[PDB]
């Protein structure tokens, strides 16, 4: 199998910066007889089909803006955006098609901004909810950058595991931040077994971790 290593997997950029994505073939995709490289680049936007940008490593698809070009030969290929615009915020994939198909891991492009600490809020279950035997505890991480954040759930100091799901918004189109919910799911009987529900948040922008907590019933 021809393997495809794409890098970097993520790129944070400003209006007008030049952007470079590198692909690496485990075997050459230069077919000697016709001297063509069997290599393509795709841009894919959320909920959309992939869109062919460049094929034969360097030929641009009709309709692709001029600022995209592909180059390289054999095992090493590069996609260049001379000057990136918000239109280009997408995920990019390389594709070898000499010997079957192999897609790269993909490269995500985000808007860079200054670091921003999240605003943390904790939300206890509602009395309405407890009537059905399940208790949902919700931790909100509001308007932070970059995406990386560690959320730790602590019930009566006891570290939770296996019983929470997170959700992240897409990078905000006006202030370039992300937001994260974390939801701890407990049974009504476990929820009332304990007192102190804590959410502990780690992020680049916080001097040290931040805990938001509440006491069941108080």
């Amino acid at each position: 199998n021809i393997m495809m290593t794409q890098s970097p997997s993520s790129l944070a950029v400003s209006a007008g910066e030049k952007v470079t994505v590198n692909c690496k073939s485990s075997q050459s995709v230069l077919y000697s007889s016709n001297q063509m490289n069997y290599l393509a680049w795709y841009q894919q936007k959320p909920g959309q089909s992939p869109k062919l940008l460049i094929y034969w490593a360097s030929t641009r698809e009709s309709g692709v803006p001029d600022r995209f070009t592909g180059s390289g030969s054999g095992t090493d290929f590069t996609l260049t955006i001379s000057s990136v615009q918000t239109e280009d915020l997408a995920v990019y994939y390389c594709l070898q098609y000499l010997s079957s198909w192999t897609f790269g891991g993909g490269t995500k492009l985000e808007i860079k901004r200054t670091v921003a600490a999240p605003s943390v809020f904790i939300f206890p279950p509602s009395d309405e909810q407890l009537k059905s035997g399940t208790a949902s505890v919700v931790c909100l991480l509001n308007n932070f950058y970059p995406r990386e954040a560690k959320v730790q759930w602590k019930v009566d100091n006891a570290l939770q595991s296996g019983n929470s799901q997170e959700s992240v918004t897409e990078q905000d189109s006006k202030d370039s931040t992300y937001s994260l919910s974390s939801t701890l799911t407990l049974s009504k009987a476990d929820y009332e077994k304990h007192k102190v529900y804590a959410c502990e948040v780690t992020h680049q922008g916080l001097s040290s971790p931040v805990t938001k907590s509440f006491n069941r019933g108080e």
């Binding site: 959700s167 937001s179 919910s181 939801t183």
Partner: protein
Amino acid sequence: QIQLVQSGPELKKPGETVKISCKASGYTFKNYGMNWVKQAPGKGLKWMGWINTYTGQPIYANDFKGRFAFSLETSASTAYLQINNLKNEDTATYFCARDWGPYWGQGTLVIVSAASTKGPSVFPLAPSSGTAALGCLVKDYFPEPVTVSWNSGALTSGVHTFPAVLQSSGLYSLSSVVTVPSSSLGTQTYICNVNHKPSNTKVDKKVEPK
């Protein structure tokens, strides 16, 4: 105008089978081999294999040997992808993509879930204790999507409605949050308006301090 048009989104119980349709158009169907690509929620593109559209022969990626089958109905210029015995890991979008050029189908989303159609329960995320957070827990509904608005649309600034998640039960769940000024709690009324068109259900919930 060449195009591939795939069949609609599919909601299926574990263990069941799904046959996805890809209808080609605007060229000689038999001259071009067809490819199938899998994309799991949030993940990269995975080539599953290829079918010879003249002779019918399939070739499978090493990870899709067993439970997957490509076939044709060349009379109708259609490629089929069948998944037998659906697992959680088959939840993904499936694309057909033709050899040579830029042509892809629009993709068929496949959800695997124990759930049947069910509308949400909505619970207040009540404000705390100069800006406060508050919101709505939209829980235990199926399938996607729900729409959430705040004060019949009057309140859009500071709103975050998160992407849904599949719980272990196979039911979706999300939260809608808003940051508002502390000083407005007890003055201003905050109502979240949840709509779920599949179950044909609509729910408003006032969210006030406890």
